[PDB]
Write a protein that binds this ligand. Structure first.
Ligand SMILES: [Mg+2]
Ligand SMILES: [Mg+2]
Ligand SMILES: [Mg+2]
Ligand SMILES: [Mg+2]
Ligand SMILES: [Mg+2]
Ligand SMILES: [Mg+2]
Ligand SMILES: [Mg+2]
Ligand SMILES: [Mg+2]
Ligand SMILES: [Mg+2]
Ligand SMILES: [Mg+2]
Ligand SMILES: [Mg+2]
Ligand SMILES: [Mg+2]
Ligand SMILES: [Mg+2]
Ligand SMILES: [Mg+2]
Ligand SMILES: [Mg+2]
Ligand SMILES: [Mg+2]
Ligand SMILES: [Mg+2]
Ligand SMILES: [Mg+2]
Ligand SMILES: [Mg+2]
Ligand SMILES: [Mg+2]
Ligand SMILES: [Mg+2]
Ligand SMILES: [Mg+2]
Ligand SMILES: [Mg+2]
Ligand SMILES: [Mg+2]
Ligand SMILES: [Mg+2]
Ligand SMILES: [Mg+2]
Ligand SMILES: [Mg+2]
Ligand SMILES: [Mg+2]
Ligand SMILES: [Mg+2]
Ligand SMILES: [Mg+2]
Ligand SMILES: [Mg+2]
Ligand SMILES: [Mg+2]
Ligand SMILES: [Mg+2]
Ligand SMILES: [Mg+2]
Ligand SMILES: [Mg+2]
Ligand SMILES: [Mg+2]
Ligand SMILES: [Mg+2]
Ligand SMILES: [Mg+2]
Ligand SMILES: [Mg+2]
Ligand SMILES: [Mg+2]
Ligand SMILES: [Mg+2]
Ligand SMILES: [Mg+2]
Ligand SMILES: [Mg+2]
Ligand SMILES: [Mg+2]
Ligand SMILES: [Mg+2]
Ligand SMILES: [Mg+2]
Ligand SMILES: [Mg+2]
Ligand SMILES: [Mg+2]
Ligand SMILES: [Mg+2]
Ligand SMILES: [Zn+2]
Lengths: 116, 23, 155, 83, 97, 127, 60, 97
RNA sequence: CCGGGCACUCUAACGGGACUGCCCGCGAAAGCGGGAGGAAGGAGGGGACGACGUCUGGUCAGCAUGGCCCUUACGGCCUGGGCGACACACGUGCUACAAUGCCCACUACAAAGCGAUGCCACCCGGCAACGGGGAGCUAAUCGCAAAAAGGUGGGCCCAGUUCGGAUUGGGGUCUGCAACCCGACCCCAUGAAGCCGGAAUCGCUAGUAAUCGCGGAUCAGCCAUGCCGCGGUGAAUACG
């Protein structure tokens, strides 16, 4: 599990690879490679273990990633669900939360169609 | 393309601006 | 249409070879009215076939065309209670259209990753008599001969 | 959400009653139509009845539900499911 | 010595752009001839019927035609005489310098 | 010493000045190839003189505005061919047969109500 | 609920958001043109009469 | 699936189901009934049952009318059948010569 | 930019221009076929324009109007809710499934419109939305404004991906008395379905289709991917 908890794609440029971490998108990819002075274009197979632990150390301390991140988002939802607010209710019934129409669509949230 | 906000093309289609399409 | 036999659009000869047939091929390559793109792809292809086989691209292209022209085709006609596949000769105008159409389509079924390359190679095979384009032509013809018996139903 | 440059919005007529009850010691039930009012730290521990268009819904405010709006806790539609 | 002419009717505009350009050319000296400023068109598009039938419209427009004339060598012979001129109703005049 | 023509295509208008010389060509402050760089459509603009061999015989000063590069290119094609007829009257024959001396009136057809575009109709489901 | 509404639309409101245009001719709340103060129907009705200055059938 | 509209009328799930069992007679012909649409409506004279159905060999459009909503529906079905039977057999007529 | 000039472009008023007028041919004629001249040719392209009537078509909710019905209420004011619900079903659309593509950076070429508690240059704070300064413009002057596709370079390498951008978490901006239900926008993270679609079915005959962006009405703001316009690029095919 090289970095950071996840084994990022070798053969790929380090900036693109880093996005294969939960919590690290393209924005944060360009950030960590500056702050550690590593060429963003270089492939993960071509990193130095010096650079790896360099890249590793910064990325794992600056931001919340993978497990602990998922834990929070859930707790945040678990919270809204428990305090019983409207946003909460939508999560409890698995319905859309950001005020979308549910007469049609809402399939991403509802899942594939249930016959009647 | 045009549906992605975090890109230049998306901000054009939508007619807005930002980091990914500045003025 | 119903009233008169429509007029064949006369195309403008292409800038690089002065050829109405080339222009026609370009347009068939052209998606979404991006003719600059279309033009490059062909001319890029024209470059490629020269590198791979040192001849006149124009000569290759034109040879590939004459090889994909169906001389005979089947056109359905429901006579009585059955649809017969009637064998028909193809008008030279139509031979051209089908040839250029199949060339591009077969090109874009090929596995190599760039259009100019696919367009290049397909034109090379069709010139030599290989490739899916010529396969189409061969097939259409075989269907026609296969139904030679119905050649009296010809209109 | 509402600009941080601007206020933390409470309808004043709702808020006033809160502070009034805070001083004398809380609490009677407070019937309000102010769905748009933020739950505010001063409100915690009270039970405010929030009109949803039909009924006034009794809402006991807690430490968890501070940042929210009052309407969020008195749902406006009755939905028990389909079929 | 600027005169700016604005009307909804161009026959009555060119009418009055002519007469101002004549008046001050008489009592001299120089009128910079009536330049036709590009028209600003205001369009209104309406559904013909009062209820539904969306795919059927009618187009109305309101055209404000502009004219500009410059009386170059003024000489208050013109300025006073101009104060009384027979201007039609569909036209509005502006004078500036 | 100078020779002139007016080219129009679609919304493009071109003012073109033919002045004899070695063949340098300028569009709006730049060389031909600088302004039409990467356009196959370009060299079609110099076609009227290629018809009467005035290829290298003329420099050309050219203004262009409105429309887009291709329409501008077609505009140029017209004007310099008017300029040639102007430079010599007997240039009409061997220019008119190539239809270089005519202006195509083909422009954008107006958008109509009830349609999505000029002619494209909205999709309807009869049943 | 109509005349009360063409009336309530006239009186200035408690908050400036609540203001909205009604057609001054027929009282219509929808498709009201600011420039004329009229709805699309009245706009058409007067224009056909010629009682809108400068306004004419637009054709191009 | 199948859609039913009750124009300016209230009907029950029962009644809706009835219509579905009635349209079901068309299943006889073993051809695809594509988006059948029934519109129930009340005139002063009686009810009206409309229907538009598409099939691989054409459309069916029929209107049934009668004081009794069920008869109106039954006549709608009768008109639809006659159409469907023509759509399904008209092609056979000219098999010779 | 200045002198200067109005040539050219343009702008916008008025005219000229095409009538099968002219030659060949067929015609009883009307016309048709071909040619030349011409920017334009046989209605030059598009628009406005819709017969007697039909659908007991549509609209008493735009308006009017017969009659029937309501009168401390079937009238009127307000606060809140709802019109935005969601086992399902259909219609219209948007964005897509990628390399003729996607991303970054630099660089060109429109038209029609709109704009004084308006349009906003330019400056500065902010990754940004935006904010604070501040000039110009009763606007062919000033502003929205950058058009986008394109062009030039660089990255991606065929993977559910640097395709796609749904869903959700968090943080902010702006309008507005107020964005819980129920706003738009920005930023970080999340990164779904979708590998080109069954029966069936829609559009389009040329500057059309396709594709690309720009404007406007409504409008505090906006749920516009809608509508009405505008130009850019620009096909395929019609035996019958
Ligand atoms: Mg990631
Ligand atoms: Mg909803
Ligand atoms: Mg993307
Ligand atoms: Mg093809
Ligand atoms: Mg094939
Ligand atoms: Mg073979
Ligand atoms: Mg429509
Ligand atoms: Mg070049
Ligand atoms: Mg267009
Ligand atoms: Mg319809
Ligand atoms: Mg009422
Ligand atoms: Mg009334
Ligand atoms: Mg309002
Ligand atoms: Mg209004
Ligand atoms: Mg139904
Ligand atoms: Mg109902
Ligand atoms: Mg019902
Ligand atoms: Mg009917
Ligand atoms: Mg029977
Ligand atoms: Mg029958
Ligand atoms: Mg002059
Ligand atoms: Mg003719
Ligand atoms: Mg007529
Ligand atoms: Mg009726
Ligand atoms: Mg009424
Ligand atoms: Mg009445
Ligand atoms: Mg009576
Ligand atoms: Mg209310
Ligand atoms: Mg509401
Ligand atoms: Mg609604
Ligand atoms: Mg159902
Ligand atoms: Mg479906
Ligand atoms: Mg849509
Ligand atoms: Mg759809
Ligand atoms: Mg793939
Ligand atoms: Mg995935
Ligand atoms: Mg999948
Ligand atoms: Mg991706
Ligand atoms: Mg959020
Ligand atoms: Mg809201
Ligand atoms: Mg398809
Ligand atoms: Mg596709
Ligand atoms: Mg099928
Ligand atoms: Mg047609
Ligand atoms: Mg596209
Ligand atoms: Mg737009
Ligand atoms: Mg506007
Ligand atoms: Mg708006
Ligand atoms: Mg929404
Ligand atoms: Zn009105």
């Amino acid at each position: 599990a090289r970095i950071a908890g996840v084994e990022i794609p070798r053969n790929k440029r380090v900036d693109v690879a880093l996005t294969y971490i939960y919590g690290i998108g393209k924005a944060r990819a360009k950030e960590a490679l500056e702050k550690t002075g590593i060429n963003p274009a270089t492939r993960v197979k071509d990193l130095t273990e010096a650079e790896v632990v360099r890249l590793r150390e910064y990325v794992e301390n600056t931001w919340k990633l993978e497990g602990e991140l998922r834990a929070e988002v859930a707790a945040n939802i678990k919270r809204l669900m428990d305090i019983g607010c409207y946003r909460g209710l939508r999560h409890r019934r698995g319905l859309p939360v950001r005020g979308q129409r549910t007469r049609t669509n809402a399939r991403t949230r509802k899942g594939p169609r249930k016959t009647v | 393309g045009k549906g992605d906000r975090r890109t230049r093309r998306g901000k054009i289609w939508r007619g807005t601006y930002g980091k990914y399409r500045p003025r | 249409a119903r009233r008169r036999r429509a007029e064949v659009r006369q195309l403008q000869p292409d800038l690089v070879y002065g050829d109405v047939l080339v222009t026609a091929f370009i347009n068939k390559i052209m998606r979404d009215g991006k003719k600059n793109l279309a033009a490059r792809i062909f001319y890029d292809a024209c470059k490629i076939i020269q590198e791979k086989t040192g001849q006149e691209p124009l000569k290759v292209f034109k040879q590939a065309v004459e090889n994909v022209k169906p001389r005979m085709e089947v056109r359905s006609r429901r006579v009585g209670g059955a649809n017969y596949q009637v064998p028909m000769e193809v008008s030279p105008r139509r031979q051209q259209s089908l040839a250029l159409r199949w060339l591009v389509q077969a090109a874009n079924q090929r596995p190599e990753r760039r259009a100019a390359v696919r367009i290049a190679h397909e034109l090379m095979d069709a010139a030599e008599g290989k490739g899916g384009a010529v396969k189409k032509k061969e097939d259409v013809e075989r269907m026609a001969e296969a139904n030679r018996a119905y050649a009296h139903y010809r209109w | 959400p509402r600009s941080l440059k601007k206020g933390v919005f409470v309808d004043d007529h709702l808020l006033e009653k809160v502070l009034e009850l805070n001083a004398k010691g809380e609490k009677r039930l407070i019937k309000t139509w102010s769905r748009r009012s933020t739950i505010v730290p001063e409100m915690v521990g009270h039970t405010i009845a929030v009109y949803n268009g039909k009924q006034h819904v009794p809402v006991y405010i807690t430490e968890n539900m501070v940042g929210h709006k009052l309407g969020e806790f008195a749902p406006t539609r009755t939905y028990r499911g389909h079929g | 010595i600027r005169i700016k002419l604005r009307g909804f009717d161009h026959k009555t505009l060119d009418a009055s752009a002519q007469k101002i350009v004549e008046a001050a050319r008489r009592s001299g000296a120089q009128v910079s001839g009536p330049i036709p400023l590009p028209t600003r068109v205001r369009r209104f598009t309406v559904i013909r019927g009062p209820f539904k039938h969306k795919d059927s419209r009618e187009h109305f427009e309101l055209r404000t035609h502009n004219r500009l004339v410059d009386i170059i060598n003024p000489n208050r012979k013109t300025i006073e005489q101009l104060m009384t001129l027979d201007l039609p109703t569909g036209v509005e005049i502006e004078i500036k310098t | 010493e100078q020779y002139y023509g007016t080219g129009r295509r679609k919304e493009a208008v071109a003012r073109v000045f033919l002045r004899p010389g070695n063949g340098k060509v300028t569009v709006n402050g730049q060389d031909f190839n600088e302004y039409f760089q990467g356009l196959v459509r370009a060299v079609a603009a110099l076609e009227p003189l290629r018809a009467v061999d005035a290829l290298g015989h003329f420099d050309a000063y050219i203004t262009v505005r409105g429309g887009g590069k291709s329409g501008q290119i077609d505009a140029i094609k017209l004007g310099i061919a008017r300029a040639l007829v102007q430079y010599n009257p007997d240039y009409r024959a061997k220019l008119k047969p190539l239809g270089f001396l005519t202006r195509d009136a083909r422009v954008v057809e107006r958008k109509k109500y009830g349609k999505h575009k000029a002619r494209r109709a909205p999709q309807y489901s009869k049943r | 609920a109509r005349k009360a509404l063409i009336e309530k639309a006239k009186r200035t409101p408690k908050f400036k958001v609540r203001a909205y245009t009604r057609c001054v001719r027929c009282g219509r709340a929808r498709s009201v043109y600011r420039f004329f103060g009229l709805c699309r129907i009245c706009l058409r009705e007067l224009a056909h009469k010629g009682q809108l200055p400068g306004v004419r059938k637009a054709s191009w | 699936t199948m859609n039913i509209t009750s124009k300016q009328m209230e009907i029950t799930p029962a009644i809706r189901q009835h219509v579905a069992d009635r349209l079901a007679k068309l299943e006889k012909w073993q051809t695809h009934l594509i988006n059948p649409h029934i519109i129930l409506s009340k005139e002063p004279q009686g009810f009206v049952a409309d229907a538009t159905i598409n099939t691989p060999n054409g459309v069916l459009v029929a209107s049934g009318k009668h004081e009794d909503m069920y008869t109106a529906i039954n006549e709608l079905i009768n008109k639809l059948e006659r159409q469907l039977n023509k759509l399904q057999h008209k092609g056979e007529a000219r098999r010779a010569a």
